[PDB]
Write a protein that binds this ligand. Structure first.
Ligand SMILES: *[C@H]1[C@H](O)[C@@H](O)[C@H](O)[C@@H](CO)[C@@H]1NS(=O)(=O)O
Ligand SMILES: O=C([O-])C(=O)[O-]
Length: 780
């Protein structure tokens, strides 16, 4: 029983008083509002908000039974009696409180009939999580396959088919009930922590995500090397074995940017060494030489680190002395029994813990470490009586990984202000992307079911801020012998998802270079393709940094007025132009692809398909997975390199998928030095744009470059433009007004500047793309 009492304004912030206390409403933007209940009282701070203390001028109108607090896009309508806030985009009702807040923390809201609800982060439950209830408590799900209610990286957030996102801005042990218990109620609970939610609206799923990342944080562009090939296993046992793996990528002619060292780098056993955070010199005798030798070959070294310091580790006494570990209520170091032994947890919420841990990361980075892997940040074990500087384990649990990332990100920026941090972690919070967190889906089983779940997990995380969500390619957990077909399908899919990191327990090889001749003959040209496609992938990365647009986009983006598409977790967009359908079972001979209506091409075979809605049936082979290209796509390639350290776009090859159904099309290629964290902010980039105009008698391309450029940027790029499905009726090409005849023979066999291959329906134009605008005009 709750009712309006009064309200004031304070720094664009509405402070409402009910019978039961204060509520602070602040627009963080024109489409996003923070609703803090118990505003009078001391709470944990926001974790989700990039700018917690921000609030923008909103307009306030008081009526008889209601208030209205509007930002521009988003309207909070505050019914006085009974007390209930609802939320409008213009006058479209998004979300209405039921009971709203009840004081354990509780929030209740109505669900509309037929409303579909994505969210919760990593679960394997179906894309629409409506009808589900699950905890908000980051926890391991070792060896998961085709089902999970609770894994490494939950998010206290949802995305509705009404096109809002709701965030429960609370770090504590909790639960989400999505109209499970009560068909028409969504309920958020926590045992403790901040009593705050955040509503974000958009006109579309893309502008919703732009709105969400605006207020929760934009991922800084990762180093281009994060888009390369990783050598990883659990785990390289020695310097010799690590050097032998880098050598195996060289002798097997697979691309390699980064080798990842698991927990044997700091001790000879799985158990009893964690917290050493220093080289096991018996097995890694010359690590500085090792990292420098790798850097000469363009290969980066990434080291695993964990929150736990064992009482058996060389750093126990020092960590206790420095007060770096979390404490019991008595005030001693909290020790508890992990798989690895008895130990404590570094308190990343404390000054002493942050400085102690930071200092260790600084020393190892100085020795030559390029990037960082933080495993077990759930935290994996976190007894309820553990005491952090700001709260107990159950209150801070879901933000530990978040703050660990922040700590490590700040540290890397202060040591190397001219480099982009690489921070790979298993657990974080809403907004962790702003600290460059790159998550993976943990200890997935080596099963088809484990593979079949990855698109669902990736889209669920991508939709709520995590563009670089990926899987251990090939699978991680148990098995006794390689499932070759599964492995191949997993590393094919890998090419078309964010981070190319095969990884698994080392009783079965995870790295493609250790596979049989057939497997290498299939995967080698696909790992090269990943590198040739860097201009496509790096451009999707750039768009992610700009707008939060995830690299993997769900099928439902193709038609926002067809909510039935929301259920799809078998087909997704890799950037704007590729519809990928991974094969997730053995012996599949053909697939039915629910391609949006329009024209589509087989990425592998150039075959043209049109559909008015009917799905497309494509046969399958072991060599590839089904990928369709959207008519109007510009697919840019550079020559394959072994390492992104050698990346050049002096030679470009661009494939344009022509069809009269697409009279207007645009592409862009974002180029910078691949390393400068300030490139976008300072416009130290080369942004190539291509526009196609396709009419009955003409096909016109406009090429341009913006940005201030960057050191080593090519002035002039040798460009091969390959036009797929080109009309056989074009006779003349103008290039900036200069007329060139189109050859109709021997295109593959002459240094032709314009040649039509009649057999392939491909028109090839070869030219110089310099800094000035270029127009190419084909006419019948
Ligand atoms: C953490 C992580 O999920 C996995 O990739 C890693 O190889 C191991 C060992 O460091 C960790 N999982 S654990 O074996 O369950 O500890
Ligand atoms: O697309 C065209 O213009 C054609 O097919 O000739």
């Amino acid at each position: 029983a709750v009712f309006y009492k009064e309200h004031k304004l304070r720094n664009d912030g509405l402070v409402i008083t009910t019978n039961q206390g204060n509520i602070r409403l602040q627009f963080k933007s024109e489409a996003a509002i923070e609703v803090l209940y118990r505003a009078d009282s001391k709470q944990l701070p926001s974790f989700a908000l990039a700018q917690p203390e921000s609030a923008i001028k909103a307009q306030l109108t008081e009526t008889e039974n209601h208030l209205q607090f509007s930002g521009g896009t988003l309207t909070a309508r505050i019914q006085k009696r009974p007390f209930a806030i609802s939320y409008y985009r213009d006058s479209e009702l998004l979300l209405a409180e039921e009971s709203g807040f009840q004081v354990k923390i509780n929030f209740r809201f109505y669900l509309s009939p037929g409303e579909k609800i994505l969210g919760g982060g990593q679960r394997i439950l179906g894309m629409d999580r409506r009808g589900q209830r699950f905890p908000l408590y980051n926890r391991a799900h070792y060896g998961y396959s085709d089902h999970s209610g609770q894994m490494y990286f939950g998010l206290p957030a949802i995305m509705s088919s009404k096109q809002y996102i709701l965030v429960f801005d609370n770090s504590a042990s909790g639960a989400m009930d999505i109209g499970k218990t009560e068909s028409d109620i969504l309920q958020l609970e926590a045992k403790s922590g901040r009593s705050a939610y955040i509503l974000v609206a958009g006109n579309s799923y893309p502008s919703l995500i732009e709105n969400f990342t605006q207020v929760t944080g934009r991922q800084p562009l990762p180093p281009r090397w994060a888009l390369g090939s990783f050598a990883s296993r659990f785990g390289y046992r020695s310097e010799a074995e690590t050097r032998a793996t880098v050598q195996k990528y060289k002798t097997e002619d697979f691309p390699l940017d980064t080798i990842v060292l698991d927990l044997y780098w700091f001790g000879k056993d799985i158990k009893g060494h964690m917290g050493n955070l220093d080289w096991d010199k018996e097995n890694f005798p010359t690590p500085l030489d090792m990292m420098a030798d790798f850097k000469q070959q363009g290969v980066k070294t990434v080291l695993i680190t964990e929150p736990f310091v064992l009482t058996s580790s060389k750093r126990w006494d020092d960590a206790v002395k420095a007060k770096a570990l979390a404490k019991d209520p008595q005030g001693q170091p909290k020790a508890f029994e992990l798989y690895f032994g008895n130990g404590g947890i570094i308190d990343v919420f404390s000054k002493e813990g942050s400085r102690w841990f930071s200092s260790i990361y600084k020393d190892l980075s100085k020795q030559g470490v390029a990037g960082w892997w933080g495993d077990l940040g759930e935290p994996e074990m976190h007894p309820e009586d553990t005491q952090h500087a700001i709260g107990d384990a159950d209150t801070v649990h879901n933000a530990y990984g978040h703050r660990w990332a922040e700590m490590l990100y700040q540290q890397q920026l202060d040591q190397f202000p001219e480099l982009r941090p690489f921070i790979m972690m298993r657990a974080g919070f809403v907004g962790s992307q702003r600290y460059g967190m790159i998550p993976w889906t943990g200890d997935v089983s080596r099963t088809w079911g484990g593979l079949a779940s990855q698109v669902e997990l990736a889209l669920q995380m991508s939709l709520l801020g995590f563009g670089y969500i990926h899987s251990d390619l090939g699978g991680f957990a148990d098995g006794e012998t390689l499932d070759k077909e599964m492995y191949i399908r997993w590393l094919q899919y890998g090419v078309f998802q964010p981070v190319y990191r095969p990884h698994g327990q080392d009783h079965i090889p995870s790295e493609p270079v250790f596979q049989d001749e057939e497997t290498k003959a299939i995967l080698r040209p696909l790992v090269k393709l990943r590198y040739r496609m860097l201009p496509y992938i790096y451009t999707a990365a750039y768009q992610n940094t700009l707008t939060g647009m995830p690299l993997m986009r769900p099928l439902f983006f193709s038609d926002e007025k067809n909510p039935a598409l929301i259920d799809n977790k078998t087909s997704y967009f890799w950037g704007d132009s590729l519809l990928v359908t991974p094969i997730t079972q053995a012996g599949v001979e053909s697939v039915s692809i629910p391609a949006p209506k329009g024209v589509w091409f087989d990425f592998w075979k150039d075959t043209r398909y049109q559909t008015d809605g009917a799905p497309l049936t494509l046969p399958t082979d072991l060599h590839t997975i089904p990928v369709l290209v959207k008519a109007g796509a510009f697919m840019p390639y550079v020559p394959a390199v072994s390492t992104t350290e050698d990346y050049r776009s002096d030679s470009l090859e661009i494939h344009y998928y022509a069809d009269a159904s697409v009279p207007l099309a645009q592409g862009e290629i974002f180029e910078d030095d691949g390393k400068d964290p300030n490139s976008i902010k300072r416009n130290q980039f080369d942004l190539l744009t291509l526009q196609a105009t396709h009419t009955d008698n003409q096909l016109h391309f406009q090429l341009a470059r913006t940005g201030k450029g960057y050191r080593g940027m090519p002035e002039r790029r040798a460009t091969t433009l390959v036009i797929h499905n080109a009309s056989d009726q074009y006779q003349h090409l103008d290039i900036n007004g200069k007329t060139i005849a189109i050859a109709q023979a021997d295109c593959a066999s002459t240094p032709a500047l314009a040649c039509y291959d009649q057999e392939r329906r491909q028109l090839q134009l070869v030219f110089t793309w310099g800094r000035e605008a270029l127009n190419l005009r084909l006419h019948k």
